[model samples]
Target: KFSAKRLPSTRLGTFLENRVNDFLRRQNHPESGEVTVRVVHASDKTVEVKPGMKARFVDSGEMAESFPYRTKALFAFEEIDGVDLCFFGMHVQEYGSDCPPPNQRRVYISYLDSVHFFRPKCLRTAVYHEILIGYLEYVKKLGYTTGHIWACPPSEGDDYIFHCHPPDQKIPKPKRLQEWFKKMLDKAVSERIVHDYKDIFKQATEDRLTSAKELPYFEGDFWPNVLEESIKELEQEEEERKREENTSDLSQKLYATMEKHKEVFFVIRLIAGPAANSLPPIVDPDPLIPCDLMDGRDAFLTLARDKHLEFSSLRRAQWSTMCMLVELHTQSQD
Candidate 1:
């Protein structure tokens, strides 16, 4: 591995550290031992674990191929029950090999932030275990196999292994990973009362929510049936308005409202597909007022449960896109 200890000295270091720490705290591990995030050097481009220590890498050869050098970063955490935490660092580099374009030499700190929250803790020696199984499922759904996992020990640094290859190229399967993660979380929540760490819990939730949008299953062709249905409804309302001249004002407003909702409903269907029926009620029923509260004096209680989920899902998808963009930018060459 190339000894690139100086790599983390740049603003990238601080950026990654802050994101990593924030992610850790969000996962309810604010005090999970002591967390230290630093960039080190490695020659084998592989992170190894030693006895009595947990070691892992944030990226491996196939995974690190996205970087300039065969450069791989490391993260290590040591946890003590009711005690302080300690961190270890390692940087591995493989020189005298074919390198990719410098443009691919990005660090992708946002991706790191996403993954750190998605999967935390030192690497353990377990075959077909949580991390391995989870990662496999993620790669399989994304249609890529060159994906890898990052694990580290405070002493030996972090380890990166090319666990499997994905089927697709450049596709990320965050939703599948989140599903796997949810299982782990449900198990933990059932077995342990670990909600004491609000930051950690928050981060975990954010990561899961973010990943849920990146699932291959989540991307599909949108149906036009809702638009057709909306158009039909609007036409019927227009006909009724012609007959009820006294309520012409109300009719016009209703027509305008339906058109606006039709647009929203169409978008929802496009992103979430026809199964997104739970979304119609959440959209802006009226063009002028925000969905959070009703504008008119009508005592009708707005913001139903379905609307809440629809808005929440939309927000979550937006957040995921933002994070992914940040990661891509961070990885880009200056």
Candidate 2:
């Protein structure tokens, strides 16, 4: 029930709008629905590692407490639609602040204060990534090559209160939050956008959550990861890759013969554990809502669900599981 719209607004209009519109347009979203970067204001408070917070710090992949006061210079971006895409908030460390002494650790930190990719629009996954990567370059253009990001952990109500958090680790069942933070860094490692990322994780947290290295900076070529080449050029590459996959001819023949002789339906019911919902009405035969899901990873702890109904995943790795489902198929007819 809180609103801060009456805060002081800066005239970041066309002065910074040139590159902003350019950055927002770098993606392939439709003209009307592409992300729009709107500069929003901020409160006068500092972004220290506020009490009882465990934000994932990107510079060293460090989490939990003991990170420095990052930035007070807050800024934001959001969609211009009634049904919007998402809103991204960030802040950078200015040279002047009343927080903890970043001291020698003062490297103008650029942290992602918050991220919310509004869904229901059927947008590609890359839209969020494009916007995120674009913002990094946008800040870098303002001239801070060295930047650090602190990724906030999920709250208890993360699942039901999605409009309040980032979409990365939505359900809040784990270390996948920091895992995803390091994941993007690993992606950059492959792209040469980063080098020696190990220098980060090993150096920082081994200090047990202290700022390990001064130059925990992200280096290398910058890009929005939106396609550089046009649609036609890339589709040809997709076509070329498509024709390159193959299987053993004998195996193909065997699979075909097997499919030809495949049995009739005897769909096994999996209504235990998290798959409990898959249980149809006892007398109704099929509930208006059917549940066929089989998952053993009970991060959600469904109680009867917690009993580990995970054979579905096991079915994927082995060939015997394929035939495992087949025996139930026939026996009734030829």
The candidate maximizing lDDT is: 2
Clashing pairs in 2: 85-118, 273-305, 274-305, 278-291
lDDT of 2 at 129: 44
RMSD of each: 25.4, 26.5
Q: Write the per-residue lDDT of candidate 2 for residues 137-246, one digit (tens) a residue.
A: 44333322223443434456432111223323334233554555455545544544333233223323342432212222211101111111222344566678777864
How high is the lDDT of residue 283 in model 1? 16
The reply for model 2, stretches above 4 Å from the true place, is 1-32, 42-86, 91-125, 138-145, 150-152, 158-169, 172-174, 186-196, 199-201, 204-334
How do all models score by TM-score?
0.21, 0.36
> Candidate 1 residues 1-334, lDDT tens each?
1112222342323434444445446556433433333332222222222211111111322222122223434333223442212122223222212323211111111012111221233422111123222322322222221221112111221111111112221222444444433444344244331111112223223324322111111001111222234345656887898778864432343344434333211100011223322322211111121211211111111222212211123233233323322332344335
- The TM-score measured for candidate 2 stands at 0.36
